[PDB]
């Protein structure tokens, strides 16, 4: 399942995101099973070069996922509080 730049090359940008997402998802899911789809979607908006790096750097992925979880939680809780 290792991903190369050559695999991404000349493929539609949407499909590059799917390719990256398929590799990121099991890792992100391991970290936060209940948030896996959402956190992966958030991370997939990042530049592909940075995503490829994250796939090779567990600490980098961990840092970015920690950030996404904090951002997602705050967004959801703020929106709920506004309507409560």
């Amino acid at each position: 399942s290792p991903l190369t730049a050559s695999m991404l090359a000349s493929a539609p940008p949407q499909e590059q995101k799917q390719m990256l997402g398929e590799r990121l998802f099991p890792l992100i899911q391991a970290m936060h099973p209940t948030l896996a789809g959402k956190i992966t979607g958030m991370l997939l908006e990042i530049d592909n070069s940075e995503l490829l790096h994250m796939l090779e750097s567990p600490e980098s992925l961990r840092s970015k996922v920690d950030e996404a979880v904090a951002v997602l939680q705050a967004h959801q809780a703020k929106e709920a509080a506004q309507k409560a």
Binding site: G21, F25, K38, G41
Partner: peptide, 16 residues
Amino acid sequence: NLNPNAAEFVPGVKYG
């Protein structure tokens, strides 16, 4: 700059 309104990623996996 992360977007909490980002679309959910849907893996080509089995669900459930």
